Amino acid sequence: GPGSMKKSARRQSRELATQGLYQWLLSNAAPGEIDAQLRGALGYDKADKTLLDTILHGVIREHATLAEAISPSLDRPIDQLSPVERAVLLIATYELTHQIETPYRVIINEAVELAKTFGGSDGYKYVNGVLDKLAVKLRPAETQARRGA
């Protein structure tokens, strides 16, 4: 399973978890509703840099299944967690799992691209603004490099 050659693989599962815990404390939705994301994507077995390769294939293949997996994971239908909320949370986390060290630029870009259909004029700025706040802490040097042209 997880390599964890020298230092614990547990870090990865935490970096995955912080997404859900953030959405929890930030969106202030019911614990289980958000917790469900891990019921669909079990972090334990996938928490390690070796599994990431497995994960990207799971992204290309099981993206749709993952998105749908939220509905049977709860006692309630998929739409409980608002369209934008779930759209961003599930995809961003699934990517984050294998993109923990990847530029927020690309992750946010993709998130914004999805936000188009879900939130449109509000959504694309909304998702940028919410992720930005973390990015300025997890990658300050890059966030300070704001190039308009």
Side-chain angles (χ1 to χ4, degrees), residues 6-145:
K6 300 187 301 186
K7 298 186 63 58
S8 306
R10 291 289 299 167
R11 183 196 306 211
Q12 300 297 328
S13 44
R14 175 57 185 185
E15 297 188 77
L16 188 161
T18 190
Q19 299 298 148
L21 279 59
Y22 172 51
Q23 172 67 332
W24 181 46
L25 300 176
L26 184 274
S27 196
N28 292 270
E33 301 301 278
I34 299 176
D35 189 85
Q37 67 178 91
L38 183 144
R39 310 300 170 152
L42 189 58
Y44 203 74
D45 307 75
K46 292 69 175 182
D48 180 79
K49 285 182 60 62
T50 311
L51 286 300
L52 308 193
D53 178 274
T54 278
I55 296 297
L56 71 87
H57 292 110
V59 163
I60 303 170
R61 176 189 300 120
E62 194 181 289
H63 228 218
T65 304
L66 196 288
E68 301 182 339
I70 189 68
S71 194
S73 183
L74 294 175
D75 299 81
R76 303 171 176 123
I78 177 175
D79 188 63
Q80 292 302 271
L81 190 60
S82 309
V84 183
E85 308 299 296
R86 64 186 184 246
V88 178
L89 208 194
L90 279 299
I91 285 62
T93 300
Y94 205 6
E95 303 315 308
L96 201 290
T97 306
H98 66 100
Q99 302 286 94
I100 67 292
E101 59 188 272
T102 305
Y104 66 98
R105 297 285 177 151
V106 306
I107 297 187
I108 296 184
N109 185 90
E110 277 68 278
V112 171
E113 197 65 275
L114 306 184
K116 305 295 184 57
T117 186
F118 296 110
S121 305
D122 301 79
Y124 92 104
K125 184 169 181 287
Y126 176 75
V127 61
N128 192 151
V130 68
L131 302 178
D132 178 81
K133 308 302 147 54
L134 295 304
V136 181
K137 323 188 305 91
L138 301 178
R139 202 55 48 158
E142 296 295 292
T143 50
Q144 293 298 330

